[PDB]
């Protein structure tokens, strides 16, 4: 009749019901560092893309200078030599990785 | 209201709300049982 305690009706038993509370109830790192290595390679690639953006901005500056010389469209500063200066960047970053591995 | 229909004298209970509400605390056992039994009779009256 209440919280699962009691009998449905006191009729039929010699008792009045009246359930009571018990009153005595006891109520008690990363193993594959190649992850970091690949993250570093990816961030180096994104730095390369950042330098490509810088190259495009320099190309816009070159286009403005060419238009000014004509006064006295869109052009590209360097088609492939920027890849060689990027190769220098690869050499420098490889040297940096070698030095860091030497330090560790 | 200010306007009604003059029920009969015996149709006014005058204390029905006393036991329709909860029982006041610290009352003896027999009083609590009386409250509960009167409420039971009222519930049976309303059900049918």
């Amino acid at each position: 009749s209440y919280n699962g305690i009691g009998l449905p009706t006191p009729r039929g038993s010699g008792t009045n019901g009246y359930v009571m509370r018990n009153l005595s109830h006891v109520k008690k790192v990363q193993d594959p560092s190649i992850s970091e290595h690949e993250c570093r390679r990816q961030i180096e690639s994104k730095l390369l893309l950042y330098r490509e953006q810088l190259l495009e901005e320099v190309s816009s500056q070159h286009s403005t200078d060419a238009a000014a010389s004509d006064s006295n469209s869109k052009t590209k500063s360097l088609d492939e030599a920027d890849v060689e200066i990027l190769v220098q960047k690869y050499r420098e970053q490889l040297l940096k990785e070698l030095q860091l591995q030497k330090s560790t | 209201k200010r306007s009604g229909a003059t029920k009969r004298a015996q149709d006014v209970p005058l204390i029905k709300h006393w036991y329709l509400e909860h029982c006041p605390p610290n009352q003896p056992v027999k009083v609590r049982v009386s409250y509960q039994k009167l409420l039971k009779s009222h519930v049976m009256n309303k059900l049918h």
């Binding site: 209440y2 009691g6 449905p8 | 909860h22 029982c23 509960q36 039994k37 039971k40």
Partner: protein, 48 residues
């Protein structure tokens, strides 16, 4: 029975083990116990 209110007869005496099966549905094995389901819950939301 709400502990301040009336107590009546069962009105439904059909609860024998005619199924003879616990139905593997209400078993403790597959049930998350968080709080006991009081009868106030069974009265406030009778259909759930």
């Amino acid at each position: 029975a709400i502990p301040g209110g009336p107590k009546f007869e069962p009105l439904y005496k059909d609860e024998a083990p005619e199924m003879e099966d616990w139905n593997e549905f209400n078993d403790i094995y597959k049930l998350i116990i968080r709080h006991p389901i009081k009868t106030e819950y069974r009265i406030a939301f009778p259909y759930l």
